[PDB]
Amino acid sequence: MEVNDLGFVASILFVLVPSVFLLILYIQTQSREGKE
Amino acid sequence: MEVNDLGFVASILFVLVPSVFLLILYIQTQSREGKE
Amino acid sequence: DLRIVVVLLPLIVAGGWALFKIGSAAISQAQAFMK
Amino acid sequence: LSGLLFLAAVWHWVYWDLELFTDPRTGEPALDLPKMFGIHLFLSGLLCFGF
Amino acid sequence: ITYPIFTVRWLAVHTLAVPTVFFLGAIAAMQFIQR
Amino acid sequence: AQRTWLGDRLRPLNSEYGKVAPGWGTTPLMGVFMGLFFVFLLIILQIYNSSLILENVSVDWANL
Amino acid sequence: GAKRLEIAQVLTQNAELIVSRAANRIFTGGSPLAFLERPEE
Amino acid sequence: MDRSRNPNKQPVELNRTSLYLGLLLIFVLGILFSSYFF
Amino acid sequence: MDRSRNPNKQPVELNRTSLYLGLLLIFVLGILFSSYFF
Amino acid sequence: ESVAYILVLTLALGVLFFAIAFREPPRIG
Amino acid sequence: MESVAYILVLTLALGVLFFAIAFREPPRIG
Amino acid sequence: GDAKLPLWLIATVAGTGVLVVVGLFFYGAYVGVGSAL
Amino acid sequence: GTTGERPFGDIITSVRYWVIHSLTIPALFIAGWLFVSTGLAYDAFGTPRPNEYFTQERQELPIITERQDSKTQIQQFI
Amino acid sequence: GFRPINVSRYGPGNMTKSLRDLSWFLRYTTYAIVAGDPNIIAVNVRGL
Amino acid sequence: MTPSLMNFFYSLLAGLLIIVVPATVGLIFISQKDKIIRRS
Ligand code: CLA
């Protein structure tokens, strides 16, 4: 079965690197409350 | 030039997903330091 | 070009009724704002 | 050039309030835009006439 | 008590009504004619 | 507020901030340079459309 | 005195412009009249 | 020539429920565009 | 049957300079192992 | 080539589960 | 293909070699 | 002026004035130049 | 609240509106009737008559071949 | 031997006394015109 | 003079003479007649 040889690079960085951007900013925010 | 067809998937997740694990854990400490 | 003449003859009796029936009050409204 | 741009990019991040960004009327940071448009475009006017 | 006759809205409502019933008289006449 | 050698040569280029020409100013000089510019933009749009085609222009691939 | 009031009645509304004529020849780096701490109403 | 401390840099406040919207939005764009990358 | 609040969960304290050690360690393992994945 | 949807489809289904259990409870004030 | 995969992870390792020198935290004595 | 007349009454004759000029158009799909007849 | 001018339910209630609209909106209606019963819209606007599409020398569904002149061709297309 | 002075070398607290004097030089001129005598100009300027 | 320049130049006559001056005279010689009142 034919494939574009590079979409699995492309659609694993398309899904991760904005979501771990988003996953950085939640654990940025939630750790501020918690009474250091 | 021959290539293994899947190392560029393999050595882009080998470098990123522990480093953005590590990049998650540094930001939280900064927020804690701030005291917010 | 006689056919353009008959089609504007209801156009000119449209405004021709607008002269006689309201226009005494229009010049008094044209007398307004001192100009 | 982008390396020499990046080394100059890190210089202004650590060094701010270099006596240039505030008015003399009070110390708040504020820069004149229309006097600076006359000196941005005069450089671009020189550079198109060069080009 | 008294209101002015002509205003901006007298010109706003006549525009798209003077070309409405002149076109409504246009379209009501074209079905009576035939090929 | 840190003086450098750099910032003592550009602070007279950024010494004032809200110095302003008086009321309504040189507006219609800018207006008539705008109306000349829109007419210039209207000329070149129909040079390129070949709707203000002239003699010896021939906007086409026969050119140099 | 009716003439002498008229000289003051031309200068009082023109005094805010006339310093911007005056200070713009002796000051360079800043548009100075805005720096004027005028007495408020 | 000498460093200082910023009177600036407000932090960011990405909410818990706003993480869910951003995580879902990337994943519908994941299931949309992955066919076209193949 | 009914919820409560934990008397637990100490947070984590990964330092600024300890980020540099972990970021470098993954990148030397990146430049080591990427030839072998090819 | 085929398991890249079923990766990212189940992450899209997985975030449907985590929004029903671990929502922020809205407290009236 | 592979040739940019080495140069990526090389210069991303070299970037931390710049960042740890300049942006080391200041140690404070107490 | 004091010649006012109930709007509701002229709401009918303007409404059926609208109705006969759109009722004439649906007559006109069935004889004429577009009817395929 | 108010605007300054006369309201609409005060306009149509006035009988002076209907003396200037018993002889005017039928007059603008019958002017649209003569725009097509005399056939002026066939001449003024470019509509072909419903006998004058296809001539004896032309059965070939006319289109404008060239953009540059485009004015002696329609007079050639009649 | 006169040059116009720059505001940045002069000082904002130093020039806020300066610019109010320029209104004050003509505010007393407008006072002396309706006073009908230039004595108040010619006495608040000697040795300024 | 070219027969497509002057056919463009008659527009800049007429697009001026029909749209612009009956907007400018058609606004300012009615707004200056109905001046608003500031004295309340
Ligand atoms: C007047 C401005 C202007 C314009 C129109 C051009 C046009 C051109 N340049 Mg160019 N250039 C300019 C200034 C300009 N240059 C200057 C100052 C420099 C020095 C930095 C250069 C450096 C340069 C290089 C190095 C190159 C070009 C190239 C080009 C060509 C293609 C790029 C292009 O389409 O740009 C079009 C640009 C514009 C339309 C920008 C104009 C901005 C205007 C002023 C904005 C205002 C419009 C206003 C809002 C509209 C309202 C007006 C009215 C209706 C009221 C083209 C011939 C490139 C090429 O391949 O051709 C050789 C190329 O290699 N030029």
Ligand SMILES: CCCCCCCCCCCCCCCC(=O)OC[C@H](COP(=O)(O)OC[C@@H](O)CO)OC(=O)CCCCCCCCCCCCCCC
């Ligand atoms: C070179 C490096 C490249 C890195 C690229 C990174 C790209 C990052 C892009 C991230 C965008 C994430 C969006 C965050 C979302 C987010 O931040 O939370 C919602 C957010 C809430 O804003 P508030 O005003 O509440 O702010 C409160 C703060 O906590 C928010 O930060 O509103 C928006 O941001 C509106 C714009 C996004 C709205 C998107 C919702 C629409 C999609 C719904 C889900 C799809 C379902 C489809 C069903 C078929």
Ligand SMILES: CCCCCCCCCCCCCCCC(=O)OC[C@H](COP(=O)(O)OC[C@@H](O)CO)OC(=O)CCCCCCCCCCCCCCC
């Ligand atoms: C399924 C999901 C899979 C996800 C996988 C995630 C894997 C995560 C692994 C992360 C490891 C990161 C290491 C953190 C590193 C780190 O945490 O900082 C150093 C850390 C400091 O500990 P401290 O006692 O100071 O604790 C203070 C805290 O802030 C630390 O959290 O010491 C160690 O952890 C020792 C073990 C690692 C020591 C490694 C140093 C040796 C390598 C040096 C660099 C290489 C250069 C070679 C030159 C040729």
Ligand SMILES: CCCCCCCCCCCCO[C@@H]1O[C@H](CO)[C@@H](O[C@H]2O[C@H](CO)[C@@H](O)[C@H](O)[C@H]2O)[C@H](O)[C@H]1O
């Ligand atoms: C191109 C468009 C041209 C067409 C323009 C015509 C559009 C206007 C349509 C007529 C206006 C609608 O008419 C609407 O009727 C209601 C009746 O409930 C009026 O209501 C009126 O009721 C009675 C009159 O008996 C009064 O006591 C009351 O004070 C008044 O409000 C509204 O004031 C009016 O807004």
